[PDB]
Amino acid sequence: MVKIRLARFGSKHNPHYRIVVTDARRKRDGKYIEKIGYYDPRKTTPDWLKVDVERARYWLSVGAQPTDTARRLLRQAGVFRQE
Amino acid sequence: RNLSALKRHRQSLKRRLRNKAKKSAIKTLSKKAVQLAQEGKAEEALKIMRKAESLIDKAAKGSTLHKNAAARRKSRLMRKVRQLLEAAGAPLIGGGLSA
Amino acid sequence: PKKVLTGVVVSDKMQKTVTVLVERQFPHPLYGKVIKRSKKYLAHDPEEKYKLGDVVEIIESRPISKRKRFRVLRLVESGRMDLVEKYLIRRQNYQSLSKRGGKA
Amino acid sequence: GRYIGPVCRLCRREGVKLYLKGERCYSPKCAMERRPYPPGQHGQKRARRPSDYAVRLREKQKLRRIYGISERQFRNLFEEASKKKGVTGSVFLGLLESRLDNVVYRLGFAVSRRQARQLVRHGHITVNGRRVDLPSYRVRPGDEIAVAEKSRNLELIRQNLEAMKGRKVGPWLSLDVEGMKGKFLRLPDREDLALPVNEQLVIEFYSR
RNA sequence: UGGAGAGUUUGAUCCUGGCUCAGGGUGAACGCUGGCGGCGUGCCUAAGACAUGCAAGUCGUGCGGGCCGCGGGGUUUUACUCCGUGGUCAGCGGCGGACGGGUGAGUAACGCGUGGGUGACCUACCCGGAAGAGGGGGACAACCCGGGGAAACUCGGGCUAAUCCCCCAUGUGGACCCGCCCCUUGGGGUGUGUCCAAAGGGCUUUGCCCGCUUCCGGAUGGGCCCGCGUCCCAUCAGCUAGUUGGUGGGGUAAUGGCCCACCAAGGCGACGACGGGUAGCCGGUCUGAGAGGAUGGCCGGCCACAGGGGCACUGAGACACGGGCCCCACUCCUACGGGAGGCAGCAGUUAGGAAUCUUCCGCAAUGGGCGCAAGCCUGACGGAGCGACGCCGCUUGGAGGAAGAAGCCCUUCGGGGUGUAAACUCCUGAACCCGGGACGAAACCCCCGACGAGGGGACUGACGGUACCGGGGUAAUAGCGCCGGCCAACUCCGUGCCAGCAGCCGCGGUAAUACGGAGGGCGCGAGCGUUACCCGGAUUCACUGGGCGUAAAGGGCGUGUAGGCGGCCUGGGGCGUCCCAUGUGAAAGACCACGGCUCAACCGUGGGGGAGCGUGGGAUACGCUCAGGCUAGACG
Ligand SMILES: [K+]
Ligand SMILES: [K+]
Ligand SMILES: [K+]
Ligand SMILES: [K+]
Ligand SMILES: [K+]
Ligand SMILES: [K+]
Ligand SMILES: [K+]
Ligand SMILES: [K+]
Ligand SMILES: [K+]
Ligand SMILES: [K+]
Ligand SMILES: [K+]
Ligand SMILES: [K+]
Ligand SMILES: [K+]
Ligand SMILES: [K+]
Ligand SMILES: [K+]
Ligand SMILES: [K+]
Ligand SMILES: [K+]
Ligand SMILES: [K+]
Ligand SMILES: [K+]
Ligand SMILES: [K+]
Ligand SMILES: [K+]
Ligand SMILES: [K+]
Ligand SMILES: [K+]
Ligand SMILES: [K+]
Ligand SMILES: [K+]
Ligand SMILES: [K+]
Ligand SMILES: [K+]
Ligand SMILES: [K+]
Ligand SMILES: [K+]
Ligand SMILES: [K+]
Ligand SMILES: [Mg+2]
Ligand SMILES: [Mg+2]
Ligand SMILES: [Mg+2]
Ligand SMILES: [Mg+2]
Ligand SMILES: [Mg+2]
Ligand SMILES: [Mg+2]
Ligand SMILES: [Mg+2]
Ligand SMILES: [Mg+2]
Ligand SMILES: [Mg+2]
Ligand SMILES: [Mg+2]
Ligand SMILES: [Mg+2]
Ligand SMILES: [Mg+2]
Ligand SMILES: [Mg+2]
Ligand SMILES: [Mg+2]
Ligand SMILES: [Mg+2]
Ligand SMILES: [Mg+2]
Ligand SMILES: [Mg+2]
Ligand SMILES: [Mg+2]
Ligand SMILES: [Mg+2]
Ligand SMILES: [Mg+2]
Ligand SMILES: [Mg+2]
Ligand SMILES: [Mg+2]
Ligand SMILES: [Mg+2]
Ligand SMILES: [Mg+2]
Ligand SMILES: [Mg+2]
Ligand SMILES: [Mg+2]
Ligand SMILES: [Mg+2]
Ligand SMILES: [Mg+2]
Ligand SMILES: [Mg+2]
Ligand SMILES: [Mg+2]
Ligand SMILES: [Mg+2]
Ligand SMILES: [Mg+2]
Ligand SMILES: [Mg+2]
Ligand SMILES: [Mg+2]
Ligand SMILES: [Mg+2]
Ligand SMILES: [Mg+2]
Ligand SMILES: [Mg+2]
Ligand SMILES: [Mg+2]
Ligand SMILES: [Mg+2]
Ligand SMILES: [Mg+2]
Ligand SMILES: [Mg+2]
Ligand SMILES: [Mg+2]
Ligand SMILES: [Mg+2]
Ligand SMILES: [Mg+2]
Ligand SMILES: [Mg+2]
Ligand SMILES: [Mg+2]
Ligand SMILES: [Mg+2]
Ligand SMILES: [Mg+2]
Ligand SMILES: [Mg+2]
Ligand SMILES: [Mg+2]
Ligand SMILES: [Mg+2]
Ligand SMILES: [Mg+2]
Ligand SMILES: [Mg+2]
Ligand SMILES: [Mg+2]
Ligand SMILES: [Mg+2]
Ligand SMILES: [Mg+2]
Ligand SMILES: [Mg+2]
Ligand SMILES: [Mg+2]
Ligand SMILES: [Mg+2]
Ligand SMILES: [Mg+2]
Ligand SMILES: [Mg+2]
Ligand SMILES: [Mg+2]
Ligand SMILES: [Mg+2]
Ligand SMILES: [Mg+2]
Ligand SMILES: [Mg+2]
Ligand SMILES: [Mg+2]
Ligand SMILES: [Mg+2]
Ligand SMILES: [Mg+2]
Ligand SMILES: [Mg+2]
Ligand SMILES: [Mg+2]
Ligand SMILES: [Mg+2]
Ligand SMILES: [Mg+2]
Ligand SMILES: [Mg+2]
Ligand SMILES: [Mg+2]
Ligand SMILES: [Mg+2]
Ligand SMILES: [Mg+2]
Ligand SMILES: [Mg+2]
Ligand SMILES: [Mg+2]
Ligand SMILES: [Mg+2]
Ligand SMILES: [Mg+2]
Ligand SMILES: [Mg+2]
Ligand SMILES: [Mg+2]
Ligand SMILES: [Mg+2]
Ligand SMILES: [Mg+2]
Ligand SMILES: [Zn+2]
C-alpha cells in the first residue's frame, strides 16, 4: 500500500531523511508522492524534526501506512495526540 | 541445486487444469443453449442458458474468469439466445430473460 | 479536453468515413517566419452526412478503427471546392517529379 | 604546497616591496633595499618593453604572491568575487583580506603572513572561542580572533604582542593587546587597503 | 552583470580565405613524479564466456504427517494402544517471488517529452462506509505399497487434514437480458425475470484479536487513445492488400484490422511517404555574451532487454533476469537411451582493450517481503578496501641570518649570478606514542492506561577503539612543463641540413636564446605534461550574425505548376499576434539567503524563479479570413 516513511538524503556519515508519502513498492530514494517533513537523527541543529501534521493526518486518513520509525517521529510531533 | 519455489509451478498446473475445466463446461453449455434457441426450442434452450449463466458467475467467484469477463459472456449469451428465439418466438420457461 | 479541429473534407470514398485536411500556422522555431504546415484526419461520419467540400469541426474521440480517432463534430460552412482543389492539384504535381510521367 | 622557498627573490622580480618576512623587510638587509633588480643571471640587464600580457601577468603574480595563496585557491576566490554583487576588484580584495591567516597577521599576532599561517596550523589561534587551524578559514564581521590560552605564554607570542603595544590597527579591525585578541569589524573597503597593486589589471588578466 | 584576440599567402599593401594557437570540459588513458584527509567516482571495448560462494523468502495464530527424543496414561504384568511435549524435515495451504538489483542490445516509435482524453478501463495489500458468514459433500500430496531409469526423475495402487475444491441456502448488494426515466459514446436510476457470497484460526475464551464474503467509495499503481516536439542521407521517390474503410463476430480489464469471415477500394507521399544509416528518450550535463552547439556517465523518471528466436500457464499484476514449454548455438554429465545449465544481481575469473576495484564488514540505521508477535530473509542498503580518476582542505617549516661561505655558472677577469638561499641561532611542532572516546538509537516489545491518546522501562553500533577531546612530541616528500614568435622566461658549451625539434609559422649546412647538456629564468605544484574527444575563439552554415562584377558563388534563356509574398478605404469574424487570471512545469541540479561538519568540497532548511502546453476572460493596430468599395499596380 502507500506509505509514510523516511527517504535518505544527507551524505556519508551525514544522514538527513525526508519523511515522505510514497508507494510501498518504489525504491526508497525514488519518486515520492509528497514530502511531509524531514528528520536529522544527529540533531545537528535546533530544528532536527518538522512534520506537516495537518498533512500527515490527511494521508493517514487515506491508508498511508507509516514505518515504525516514521510513526515514532510523527508521534513526537503530536500527529496522534488527540488530547 | 535450487529454490523450493518450484512449488508455484506445481500449483500453477493444478490451478491451470482447474480453470481449463470450468471453462470447457461454460463453452459447451453456451453453445448448447445457442443451438437450442436457434432451433426454436425455447423452454429447453432457456433451461440450459441458466446453467451457463450460473457456471459463468461461479467461474467468476474465483480467479477463473472473474472480472467483467463473466458479464461479457452472460451478455453475448442472453443476446444470441433472445434473438435466435425471436425468429419463431415464445420464451416459455422465462428462464433468465427478463420480461 | 477532447481536442477539436477544423478542416476541409478532401475525400469521402470511404464508408462512414471522410478525410479532413486540417491546417495550422506557427512561428518557425529558429527563423520566426510564420509557416503553415497541415495534416489529414480520417473522421467518423456514420450517417454519410458530410460531402466533399465541407469545412467541418472534428473532435477527439474513442477509436473507431485503426487510423481513425476523430468524429465529425459539425458543419462549419458548406461547399467550397476551392480548397479541395489546391489539395487535388498539389497531389497531381507529384506525378511530374519522379522518373515516370506527369503534368506541369 | 603554498610555495615554500626563497621569498625575497619574489620581491626582486615584482620590483616592489612585499613583506614576506615582517622584520628585516624594514631593515637595510631587505635585499630590495640593495638589489631592486630581478633575480638571476640577467637581473641587471636592460628590461625590454613588457607585453600587455606580461604586465597583467606580473601584476596578478604580485597580488597573489603577497598573500602566499595558491593559484588554485587564488583563482577560486576571484571567480567567487566575480559572481558576487559589486565591483569585483574590491570584493576580491575583501575576500583575500578575510582569510584568518591574513587577519592573524593584521592583528600583529605574527610578524609575517607566512608566520601567521603556521600559528594557525599549529592551533595557536582561536575564533570566537573554538580553535581553528585552517589558514583559509573565512573571518566574518563580528568574529573575534584571539590567541590560544595554552599558547599565550609562548616566547614568540610574547614578543609579537608586546611590540603591538602602541601600534595601530586597520580601521576594519580592533586589537586588544592585553587580552591577546581582536575583532574583525567589517570587510575592508578598497581605500583602507594600500596594496601596490592595480586590481583592475588582475580582473583583465582573467578576462583573456 | 554580459561579448579581448593572435600567428601564417606578399618585396611591401589592402581584401578574401583556410589552417593553427591561447580558454573551459571528460566515467579518461599514457609518461615523469607522488606525503595526509574528507567527499565523490571507477569495463566507455566482447548484450563475449563464466569456476566458486552469497544474491527471495516467510507464516506451526491455515492443515495433516514422517524421522529422532523425553514425559504421562489404559492392564495384575507384557503386549498393544491413548495423551502431552522438544528437535528436525519436507508436504498440502497462504502472501511475497511482477518489488528491489543489472544492462542499453533492440527501438526514429505514441518509445520518450509536454499537454490532454477514457460515456473504452483494471488495480493485491492499505483506508472509510453498508451487509453477511446456516447446512452438506469431495479430492490430491504428505505417508504407505509396488514397477521403470545410469541419472535427472518418473508410472501405478491405497489412506488423509485444512483458510484446498464442490453443492444447497441466505441476497445487504452486485452481474446479465428487456423496458422506462434522467444523462449523453458503454454515465446514473428504476422495474420484472434469471444468475452470484463466504473460512476459519488465536486466546489474558464467552469478549476481544487475526482472518473470510458481497457491494459503494477513497488512495496508490497502471492500460489504452489523442495534439505538438524528437538525428543523418533524396546518389532512397514513389509506398501499401489486413493494405484503407464498412457490417457481423472473436478476443481483452478496455477502445481498435488487435484477429477472423464477408462487402467496399481504398490509405500514405516533396509539409519527404517508402528505403538506407545511426541511436534507448528525459530531468539535466559541458560549452557559449547570448542565440546556439555538443552531449545523455553518475543521480532521479520513463522505456526495452535478461545466451538467440517463438509461446503461453499461473496470478490483482508477467508473457515473468535467479518460473515453465519448443527450436537454435554453446558448456558440462552420460551405463549413448537421455539429462543439466545461462552473473546485463554482489564479489571474483577469463577474453578483448590504452583502461575501469574487494571472491571485504554488517543488518546497527533507512527501505522491502512474510509473520499477531518474538523474529526470519534482504550482495537493496549502511560501511570499510583499492586506484591522485575528480573536487575540496592540509603538510614538507616559522623568525633571525654576509655590502654575501664553498661548489657550480657567466665575465669586460674589475666583477656579476644561484641568495637569505645554505650552514648556523632561536621558535612552533605534521608524523608518531599515551589517556579518554562519540553522535548516528528509539522505536518494534513489555508494564500502566482502553492492545487507542498519554506515560514508564528494557534491548540494540557494521562503521570502530574510527571521528573528535586531552597529554607528550621529531624540522621532517618535491616535482613536472616551458624559456624563437604567437607566449611569461637567456646565456656558455656541445653538434654542423648531422643528431634531432616541430601546435602553426619554421629551426639545424661552424660561433643556434629553436637540436642536446649545463647555469639561470618563467609557470604550476601532489602534481605537471601528453594523446584523444566536445564547446569556444569560428559573424568559418551568419536566426541573433555572411555572402555571389573581377576573391568560392547567378541557373544559358523563356514559359509556367506548387509554394512564398501582396495597392487604397470600410465592415463582420478574432486563426496568427498581444494582455489578465488560472492549472501544469516532481525531486535532484542551477541561482540567492541562512545553517551543519573547525573551513571547504559536501550537505540541510528556506526563498526566487522558469520557456512550453491546458482553461477562463479581454484587446483588435498589424497579418489572416469573409463581405463591400476604389483606381495609383496589372490588364484591355
Ligand atoms: K482514503
Ligand atoms: K484453484
Ligand atoms: K501516385
Ligand atoms: K568483466
Ligand atoms: K503503445
Ligand atoms: K497414512
Ligand atoms: K500417489
Ligand atoms: K431483480
Ligand atoms: K476499491
Ligand atoms: K484511480
Ligand atoms: K489515468
Ligand atoms: K469489428
Ligand atoms: K542573441
Ligand atoms: K541538441
Ligand atoms: K539529444
Ligand atoms: K538537450
Ligand atoms: K504486518
Ligand atoms: K504508549
Ligand atoms: K594531540
Ligand atoms: K628543516
Ligand atoms: K663549435
Ligand atoms: K649559422
Ligand atoms: K638554447
Ligand atoms: K636548447
Ligand atoms: K572548435
Ligand atoms: K555560370
Ligand atoms: K542547363
Ligand atoms: K475588423
Ligand atoms: K548552463
Ligand atoms: K497560458
Ligand atoms: Mg511457499
Ligand atoms: Mg466439447
Ligand atoms: Mg462516404
Ligand atoms: Mg494537427
Ligand atoms: Mg562582481
Ligand atoms: Mg594567412
Ligand atoms: Mg609562411
Ligand atoms: Mg587569418
Ligand atoms: Mg599568391
Ligand atoms: Mg614572406
Ligand atoms: Mg573568451
Ligand atoms: Mg609510479
Ligand atoms: Mg574513497
Ligand atoms: Mg558495458
Ligand atoms: Mg553458478
Ligand atoms: Mg546472504
Ligand atoms: Mg515447514
Ligand atoms: Mg526494475
Ligand atoms: Mg555500464
Ligand atoms: Mg540501447
Ligand atoms: Mg530506420
Ligand atoms: Mg503524447
Ligand atoms: Mg479515467
Ligand atoms: Mg474494507
Ligand atoms: Mg469435509
Ligand atoms: Mg520407484
Ligand atoms: Mg491415487
Ligand atoms: Mg438481490
Ligand atoms: Mg440502465
Ligand atoms: Mg434492474
Ligand atoms: Mg427462480
Ligand atoms: Mg447460491
Ligand atoms: Mg474463535
Ligand atoms: Mg466490435
Ligand atoms: Mg468488446
Ligand atoms: Mg493489421
Ligand atoms: Mg493504389
Ligand atoms: Mg544501440
Ligand atoms: Mg558565438
Ligand atoms: Mg553558463
Ligand atoms: Mg545553453
Ligand atoms: Mg538514471
Ligand atoms: Mg552474456
Ligand atoms: Mg497474488
Ligand atoms: Mg488469469
Ligand atoms: Mg521471475
Ligand atoms: Mg517483460
Ligand atoms: Mg542470473
Ligand atoms: Mg590484453
Ligand atoms: Mg536491516
Ligand atoms: Mg526493517
Ligand atoms: Mg655563493
Ligand atoms: Mg628561513
Ligand atoms: Mg604544545
Ligand atoms: Mg621544543
Ligand atoms: Mg529488531
Ligand atoms: Mg501483556
Ligand atoms: Mg492493557
Ligand atoms: Mg510510548
Ligand atoms: Mg617573452
Ligand atoms: Mg665542432
Ligand atoms: Mg651527429
Ligand atoms: Mg653554436
Ligand atoms: Mg636571448
Ligand atoms: Mg621553443
Ligand atoms: Mg558558430
Ligand atoms: Mg543572416
Ligand atoms: Mg564570406
Ligand atoms: Mg569567380
Ligand atoms: Mg545570366
Ligand atoms: Mg515568370
Ligand atoms: Mg502563383
Ligand atoms: Mg494587404
Ligand atoms: Mg495568399
Ligand atoms: Mg485568437
Ligand atoms: Mg503559466
Ligand atoms: Mg525542480
Ligand atoms: Mg558554516
Ligand atoms: Mg532547495
Ligand atoms: Mg512567460
Ligand atoms: Mg486563452
Ligand atoms: Mg471586434
Ligand atoms: Mg478584417
Ligand atoms: Mg475587394
Ligand atoms: Zn623582502
Swiss-Prot record, chain A:
Source domain of life: Bacteria
Keywords: Ribonucleoprotein, Ribosomal protein
Gene Ontology MF: a single term: structural constituent of ribosome
One GO cellular component term noted in the UniProt record for this chain: cytoplasm
InterPro entries from the UniProt entry: Ribosomal_bS16, Ribosomal_bS16_dom_sf
One Pfam family hit: Ribosomal_S16
GO BP annotation list: translation
Sequence similarity: Belongs to the bacterial ribosomal protein bS16 family.
Protein purpose: Binds to the lower part of the body of the 30S subunit, where it stabilizes two of its domains.
Subunit structure: Part of the 30S ribosomal subunit.
The protein, known as: Small ribosomal subunit protein bS16
Gene: rpsP
From Swiss-Prot, chain B:
NCBIfam families reported for this sequence: S20 (TIGR00029)
UniProt KW keywords: Ribonucleoprotein, Ribosomal protein, RNA-binding, rRNA-binding
Region annotation Disordered: where it falls in the sequence: 1-26
InterPro entries assigned to the protein according to its UniProt record, in alphabetical order: Ribosomal_bS20 (IPR002583), Ribosomal_bS20_sf (IPR036510)
Role summary: Binds directly to 16S ribosomal RNA.
Name this polypeptide is given: Small ribosomal subunit protein bS20
UniProt record, GO biological process: translation
Organism: Thermus thermophilus (strain ATCC BAA-163 / DSM 7039 / HB27)
GO molecular function annotation: small ribosomal subunit rRNA binding; structural constituent of ribosome
Similarity comment: family membership: Belongs to the bacterial ribosomal protein bS20 family.
Biased amino acid composition, Basic residues: 1-25
Pfam families recorded: Ribosomal_S20p
Gene: rpsT
GO cellular component: small ribosomal subunit
Organism superkingdom: Bacteria
Lineage of origin: Bacteria, Thermotogati, Deinococcota, Deinococci, Thermales
Swiss-Prot record, chain C:
PROSITE patterns listed in its UniProt record: RIBOSOMAL_S17
Pfam family, one: Ribosomal_S17
Gene Ontology biological-process annotations: translation
Source organism superkingdom: Bacteria
Cellular component terms (Gene Ontology): cytosolic small ribosomal subunit
Annotated keywords: Ribonucleoprotein, Ribosomal protein, RNA-binding, rRNA-binding
GO molecular function, one term: rRNA binding
NCBIfam families reported in the protein's UniProt record: PRK05610.1, uS17_bact
UniProt subunit comment: Part of the 30S ribosomal subunit.
Function: One of the primary rRNA binding proteins, it binds specifically to the 5'-end of 16S ribosomal RNA.
Stated family: Belongs to the universal ribosomal protein uS17 family.
Official protein name in the record: Small ribosomal subunit protein uS17
UniProtKB/Swiss-Prot annotation, chain D:
Cofactors: Zn(2+); [4Fe-4S] cluster
UniProt cross-references to Pfam families, sorted A to Z: Ribosomal_S4, S4
Highest taxon in the source lineage: Bacteria
GO BP term, example: translation
A molecular-function term among this protein's GO annotations: structural constituent of ribosome
Assembly and oligomerization: Part of the 30S ribosomal subunit. Contacts protein S5. The interaction surface between S4 and S5 is involved in control of translational fidelity.
Function description: One of the primary rRNA binding proteins, it binds directly to 16S rRNA where it helps nucleate assembly of the body and platform of the 30S subunit. Binds mRNA in the 70S ribosome, positioning it for translation.
Protein name: Small ribosomal subunit protein uS4
Organism of derivation: Thermus thermophilus (strain ATCC 27634 / DSM 579 / HB8)
Lineage: Bacteria, Thermotogati, Deinococcota, Deinococci, Thermales
